[PDB]
Design an enzyme around this catalytic site. Sequence first.
Site, PDB file in Angstrom:
ATOM      1  N   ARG A 177     -14.945  28.159  -7.038  1.00 27.57           N
ATOM      2  CA  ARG A 177     -15.744  27.496  -6.027  1.00 27.57           C
ATOM      3  C   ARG A 177     -15.732  26.067  -6.541  1.00 27.57           C
ATOM      4  O   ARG A 177     -15.244  25.773  -7.678  1.00 27.57           O
ATOM      5  CB  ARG A 177     -17.231  27.925  -5.518  1.00 27.57           C
ATOM      6  CG  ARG A 177     -17.037  28.745  -4.189  1.00 27.57           C
ATOM      7  CD  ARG A 177     -18.432  28.466  -3.321  1.00 27.57           C
ATOM      8  NE  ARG A 177     -18.362  26.718  -2.758  1.00 27.57           N
ATOM      9  CZ  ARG A 177     -19.307  26.146  -2.540  1.00 27.57           C
ATOM     10  NH1 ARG A 177     -20.474  26.733  -2.707  1.00 27.57           N
ATOM     11  NH2 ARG A 177     -19.410  24.899  -2.006  1.00 27.57           N
ATOM     12  N   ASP A 191     -24.879  30.476  -7.676  1.00 28.06           N
ATOM     13  CA  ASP A 191     -24.435  29.021  -8.083  1.00 28.06           C
ATOM     14  C   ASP A 191     -24.166  28.700  -9.668  1.00 28.06           C
ATOM     15  O   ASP A 191     -23.309  28.227  -9.900  1.00 28.06           O
ATOM     16  CB  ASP A 191     -25.558  27.920  -7.725  1.00 28.06           C
ATOM     17  CG  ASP A 191     -25.184  27.523  -6.184  1.00 28.06           C
ATOM     18  OD1 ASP A 191     -23.950  27.471  -5.842  1.00 28.06           O
ATOM     19  OD2 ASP A 191     -26.038  27.486  -5.458  1.00 28.06           O
ATOM     20  N   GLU A 205     -24.011  14.776  -5.591  1.00 30.91           N
ATOM     21  CA  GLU A 205     -22.795  15.173  -5.576  1.00 30.91           C
ATOM     22  C   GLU A 205     -21.764  13.933  -4.985  1.00 30.91           C
ATOM     23  O   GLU A 205     -21.396  14.008  -4.054  1.00 30.91           O
ATOM     24  CB  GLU A 205     -22.557  16.378  -4.848  1.00 30.91           C
ATOM     25  CG  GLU A 205     -23.416  17.601  -5.179  1.00 30.91           C
ATOM     26  CD  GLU A 205     -23.055  18.707  -4.068  1.00 30.91           C
ATOM     27  OE1 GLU A 205     -23.037  19.773  -4.682  1.00 30.91           O
ATOM     28  OE2 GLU A 205     -22.963  18.641  -2.970  1.00 30.91           O
ATOM     29  N   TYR A 229     -16.758  22.076   0.846  1.00 28.36           N
ATOM     30  CA  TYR A 229     -17.054  20.760   0.118  1.00 28.36           C
ATOM     31  C   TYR A 229     -15.861  20.107   0.489  1.00 28.36           C
ATOM     32  O   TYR A 229     -14.493  20.389   0.947  1.00 28.36           O
ATOM     33  CB  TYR A 229     -17.258  20.942  -1.424  1.00 28.36           C
ATOM     34  CG  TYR A 229     -18.660  21.030  -1.863  1.00 28.36           C
ATOM     35  CD1 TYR A 229     -19.498  21.441  -0.928  1.00 28.36           C
ATOM     36  CD2 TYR A 229     -18.917  20.979  -3.266  1.00 28.36           C
ATOM     37  CE1 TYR A 229     -21.207  21.723  -1.282  1.00 28.36           C
ATOM     38  CE2 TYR A 229     -20.337  21.297  -3.520  1.00 28.36           C
ATOM     39  CZ  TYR A 229     -21.306  21.477  -2.898  1.00 28.36           C
ATOM     40  OH  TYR A 229     -22.754  21.639  -3.056  1.00 28.36           O
TER      41      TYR A 229
END
EC number: 3.2.1.18
Lengths: 389, 389, 389, 389
Positions: free
Chosen positions: B39, B72, B199, B332
Amino acid sequence: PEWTYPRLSCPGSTFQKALLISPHRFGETKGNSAPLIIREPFIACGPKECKHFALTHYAAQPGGYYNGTRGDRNKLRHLISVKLGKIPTVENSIFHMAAWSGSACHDGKEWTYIGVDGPENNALLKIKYGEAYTDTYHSYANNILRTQESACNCIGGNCYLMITDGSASGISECRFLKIREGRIIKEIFPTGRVKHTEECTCGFASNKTIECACRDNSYTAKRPFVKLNVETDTAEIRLMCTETYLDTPRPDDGSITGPCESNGDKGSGGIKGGFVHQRMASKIGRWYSRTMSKTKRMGMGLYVKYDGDPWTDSDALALSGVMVSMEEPGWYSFGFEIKDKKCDVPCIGIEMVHDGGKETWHSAATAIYCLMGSGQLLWDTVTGVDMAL
Amino acid sequence: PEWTYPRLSCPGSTFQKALLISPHRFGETKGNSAPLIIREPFIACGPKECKHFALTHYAAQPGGYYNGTRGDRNKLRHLISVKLGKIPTVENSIFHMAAWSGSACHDGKEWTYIGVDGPENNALLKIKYGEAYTDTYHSYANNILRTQESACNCIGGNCYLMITDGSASGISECRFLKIREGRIIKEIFPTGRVKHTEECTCGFASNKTIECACRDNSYTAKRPFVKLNVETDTAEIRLMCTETYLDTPRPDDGSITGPCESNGDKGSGGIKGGFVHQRMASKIGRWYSRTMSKTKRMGMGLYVKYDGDPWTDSDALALSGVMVSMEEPGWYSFGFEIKDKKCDVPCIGIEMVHDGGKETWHSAATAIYCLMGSGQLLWDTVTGVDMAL
Amino acid sequence: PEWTYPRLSCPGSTFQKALLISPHRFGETKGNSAPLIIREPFIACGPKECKHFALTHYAAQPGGYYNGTRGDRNKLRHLISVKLGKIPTVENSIFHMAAWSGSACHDGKEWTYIGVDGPENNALLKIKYGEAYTDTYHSYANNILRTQESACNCIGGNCYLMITDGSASGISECRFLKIREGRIIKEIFPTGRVKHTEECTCGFASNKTIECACRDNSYTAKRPFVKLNVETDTAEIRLMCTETYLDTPRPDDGSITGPCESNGDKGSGGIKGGFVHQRMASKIGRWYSRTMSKTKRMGMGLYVKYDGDPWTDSDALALSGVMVSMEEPGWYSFGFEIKDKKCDVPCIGIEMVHDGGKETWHSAATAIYCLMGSGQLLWDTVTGVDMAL
Amino acid sequence: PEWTYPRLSCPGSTFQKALLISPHRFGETKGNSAPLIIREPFIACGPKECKHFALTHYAAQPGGYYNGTRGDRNKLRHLISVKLGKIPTVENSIFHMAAWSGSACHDGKEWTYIGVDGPENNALLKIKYGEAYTDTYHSYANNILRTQESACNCIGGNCYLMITDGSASGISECRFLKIREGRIIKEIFPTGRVKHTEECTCGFASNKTIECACRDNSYTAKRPFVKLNVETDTAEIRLMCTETYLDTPRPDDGSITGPCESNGDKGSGGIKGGFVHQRMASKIGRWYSRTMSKTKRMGMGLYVKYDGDPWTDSDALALSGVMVSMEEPGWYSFGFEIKDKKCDVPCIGIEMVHDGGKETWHSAATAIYCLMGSGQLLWDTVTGVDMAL
Ligand SMILES: CCC(CC)[C@H](NC(C)=O)[C@@H]1[C@H](O)[C@@H](C(=O)O)C[C@H]1NC(=N)N
Ligand SMILES: CCC(CC)[C@H](NC(C)=O)[C@@H]1[C@H](O)[C@@H](C(=O)O)C[C@H]1NC(=N)N
Ligand SMILES: CCC(CC)[C@H](NC(C)=O)[C@@H]1[C@H](O)[C@@H](C(=O)O)C[C@H]1NC(=N)N
Ligand SMILES: CCC(CC)[C@H](NC(C)=O)[C@@H]1[C@H](O)[C@@H](C(=O)O)C[C@H]1NC(=N)N
Ligand SMILES: *[C@@H]1O[C@H](CO)[C@@H](O)[C@H](O)[C@H]1NC(C)=O
Ligand SMILES: *[C@@H]1O[C@H](CO)[C@@H](O)[C@H](O)[C@H]1NC(C)=O
Ligand SMILES: *[C@@H]1O[C@H](CO)[C@@H](O)[C@H](O)[C@H]1NC(C)=O
Ligand SMILES: *[C@@H]1O[C@H](CO)[C@@H](O)[C@H](O)[C@H]1NC(C)=O
Ligand SMILES: [Ca+2]
Ligand SMILES: [Ca+2]
Ligand SMILES: [Ca+2]
Ligand SMILES: [Ca+2]
Ligand SMILES: [Y+3]
């Protein structure tokens, strides 16, 4: 290109977790990979590349050659490598030579590869320079001629290698070979406490001295400690005096009575131990690792001591961090140095063996810790592998 | 070789579909391949090579380590890469370092790799230059120290990197690190709207300024927008004023009342967003991407605006095309630039996650769109993958 | 490095069997490989490397994505390559761009990659130079914009590409693009018999002229024949006059009455055809290939003619040898040239499709024939593949 | 780079076990690998790389193309290679050309690859230089034109190759080709005992002479022995006079009565034999290998003789060591030399065939022995492979 020499280590005051090579995360029945079955891993780096070496049993997981992968020596065993960061599968690896004991090092121009095989009573060490087989050394005590299972060390084109021969239970007096462009140019016979020395983990303390923390598999849980002068080519060995005994098995810390030289108890059996140098302008750090358990090959803690003389200092080593918890396997450990642009980076690697007995496969992961930045060591390493899969 | 700098973008006025990396097209039970479970993918390019990065869970499809691949952070997670165009399988990939948050960038002479691991309340950012581990930065708010999940940006050998630390639900005040040959040479504390920033997707607007479109995971569906002056090393942050809110979740376009600074509604939760610069002689284009759905991680639309000031312009962004239809996953998204012989080509990449819940595997394809030629954007991207196989 | 130019061919007066690429010899249920499912293969060579290209359906054998692999165009289709000699599997191949029609060529300094995708009524040609996407061309007749399925041709850094657009059943008037460092610098509109031209197989007849043997998929079983002047950038097209009709389907040889320009019968349908030049000091040979069967995609014979004008010569082409027996599949065929130290080697390649209908997989092997030595062509090629396995 | 020449051998007086390539250790049903099915392996080295060649049946284990893998020639057979040390799997290998008989050699600048295919009564030898097909030689006795199955030999850019043609049961009069940058520039017709000569294993005895130990498949168990003068390009053949007959089958040592030239008994059938030179300042060593069994392809012993003339010396060869025990398979064997920095290292390689009859797969491992150090040869080689798995 030119001959390389040890330099000042890069700035730092703590090790951290760097990288895990766990090839067996991809060895399931239900997967489609071929990680090689290995043990005795170690790392060695040149000016552009770090290679990850190991001794394979010439079999893979999954497969049908599991029988014999707990054994130490056979006619199939080989020294293999990959570029550090690649998974050592059947296709990724390169097979260097037959060997059930190995070492390797870069002199600045080229790779030297070292591998021992042959029978129990008359084994043979073999040397390869780049692609060429170049020299051999013969068994001198006729009982399993043997080498480091870690990186040899080259300076100014002269590479130095520890070997031993003798009984795993009795006397095993080690020697050092000095090797240049694949050929042996001097034998070095150490003086002092030479009763029993194996699997030296060696590095440069400076342009003048190589030091090694080794294994006594019979007499003591203190690690024998070698100081090799590379200018005069002389070597000396005494036991480490610290109360933080680095072998496994071992008794409680500090409970061996007498002065630095005493053996004394729980000395039969042993393990290869990590050891690397942090070279500073006016100071030297010595970093070491040892199992978390006193009896078993479980866990690995990192320890450190600055300056002094490891032969006479009885002071306890400072515990720096837990790299492998007690619930994970901690087998062999070793040192190596990565070459940054203008300085060298000290690192400790840890073999993390998947052991389920002689009725199934036997191999290992490899965890890597390096000196980076300041503070305290923060995180431990698990393999993630379930051996039933 | 020499230090690199941003140049004028190549000629073009529209993006097109360029390339799909769908490794799970080869992960069937009935097949014979080993695509890595990953990911947070992203791309970063040097003067000769583009590398495709991702954060793996150190497991492959098919295999038996699916449990935990929706999580995560854990101790197995690693930064990995292949040369863009290669399928990231077990054997094709290289493992750079342990990490559950990453970034990377080329300075013209060498690759810098960034990875964060360690525990929740004291994570640690780690820096690697080529093969050497070189530096670290410590958690400063003691709640998941974190980085971009996309390319850092290097000028004249100085690389700039966003980090953050703090509660995913409350305050998370970001900083920027200035990194030279693997070592940190300045901390930059931004001023202005600093309440919550994550991010950042960053690039050069010119030789003087880096801009980032980021994520507020608590307070607003407007993207925070960073302007970093790289000559004075100062940074400022204000919310994007456009009525075309770029986050997910988000309310209807234009429905946040008040001036440019208002938060206001549906601000909790969020996504990393695509953003890349088109640098022309007397003009600058800003390209952005956002999900097709307002609530869900489905689809991806490309948007553009030329000139103006994104802090004060409330004008709507021009919808350029649909890159991923509402029936395909759009997670994303990120920006990067490919280096042609004399000019730079802006591109947007899109993480297209195979989500079937916690009871099966969790990974992602990567779709790539780049500025090429004139006209309008013509075709969308599907992954082709059926998760039952 | 420098721009390349066509040179005199290497010595020889016959083709021989060179090399087979049959990836599906390794696609059994009982094996452990991943050959990619492909069609439309072709080969293009630079000064050091020959690459083997194909259009994949982004699926592998064995796998569970066989449904749709008989189709011509979809959203997953991609241009891939390997170094000629390597089996194109999942891991060995590199994915260049999305495409359901392709071409490639080296100009002496760098590789140009060409791929068309997009929807039926508005497809889009895309150009990539090394790693960078650099330009596009738009559909001009709004019916499946289309390209060669073989090597473009570069001289003095200028690369020439055939394209077409229009109805597969009606008018499809082709154009030529002139491309320099990944960018289009001239459109060339051919004159003459332009009714219907596809999939030109093109090469240099000299430093001045490119010639192409093409496909008319509606009107005639004579091959259209292009002569492009690269100094003036003009192109002309007339039908091949020979009684040895090169298309499939076709009527008996010589049975189309009238002069060189007559269509006449069995003209609807067609195949891509092999064609390459043998350039000698004061002579030119033209080598061509065609199915062994008149109706069906079975077999492949090699034919040759020295000098003359293919537009006006009704003489029969000399049958040189059988490359693929009538019992083996013979689909697309193409030409390319290998670069020896001081001369160029003409070659013909043959797509050898494994066809079992729409209920199972659909791919192809690739057989290669080159000019080597003297005498007659000696041996045919089989794929060796049984499609049940 | 420059043309290469033979140099003085590296120091040493005994061979040792160097390396095993056993690809079929990874061919289990239970495994996930794809070793190629091969026979007739051999090794050839240039100034930086050693390549491991073989003739594949274009099939892998496990797979479903085992039928025909015991056959000698077919239309699928190919010359393949890997870098020595790599397992020759589907992905790792490179396919050079179609061939059921081969050879290869480096001239100092580039690789020459040799392969023969075509039908029984008119086969064809094909030559490829780097990537280019460059020349051919035609069958001259119209019965299986054939070559060495080992390395050709290059000096000052001129490469010398043995070929033969004729009945495997009767007359097969060999010739030699002299090849320069891929093209044949002389045919050399040997004089003397030319009745029957095959599969010469050739090397340099000096800058002036090439010597080959070959196979007579009809008449005698003495090996024919070739001496080629490379300055005059003349060649002569006579039988080896030694009482240590090197062929298989063979009668008891010394039991062929008469002078050096007698045939006499058990001469029909044969094997390709190992042979390599050790060139010293004022002395020359000739190393040879032969099966342990007199009748069967089991075992391999190493033998040696210094100086003299092998055409006239009836003295027994000195037995140096057992490379493969009587319980392991010992098929073809061959010589090659590795290039160290300033000297050449003589080696013998051994094909170790997995033979279980025509009803299952047929392939081979490859064991390597090289001159290294002093003493006596110490250890034998096993393949480790169980053919049921
Ligand atoms: C008998 C001598 C031992 C060293 C003290 C022994 N080494 C060899 C070369 O056999 C090691 C020991 O038995 C095993 C271990 O302690 O883990 C590994 C084993 N090491 C290797 N197989 N390379
Ligand atoms: C809690 C902080 C989050 C960023 C706002 C979180 N990041 C980390 C480092 O854990 C992301 C978020 O929870 C997941 C997502 O939104 O897709 C991915 C996840 N990102 C990563 N696993 N790298
Ligand atoms: C309809 C136009 C056709 C060319 C005459 C058609 N080309 C495309 C781009 O669709 C080809 C044809 O239908 C198939 C064949 O003839 O084998 C291949 C097919 N070619 C490709 N799929 N690249
Ligand atoms: C009939 C001639 C034989 C040489 C004496 C025969 N050679 C060829 C080219 O077919 C060899 C022989 O039959 C087999 C062997 O003896 O192992 C191998 C086989 N060699 C190869 N398949 N390359
Ligand atoms: C060792 O020697 C070389 C010069 O010969 C020098 O450049 C280097 O700095 C020295 N190493 C250390 C640790 O001082
Ligand atoms: C940035 O700086 C360099 C010179 O230092 C220059 O060559 C380059 O063109 C500049 N970039 C832009 C976008 O103008
Ligand atoms: C084409 O041009 C170059 C010189 O520009 C020359 O070297 C080459 O020989 C020419 N090609 C042919 C086929 O004559
Ligand atoms: C052969 O020739 C070259 C010079 O042409 C020389 O360097 C080399 O030493 C010679 N070989 C031997 C074996 O003497
Ligand atoms: Ca001990
Ligand atoms: Ca939000
Ligand atoms: Ca037609
Ligand atoms: Ca015989
Ligand atoms: Y593979």
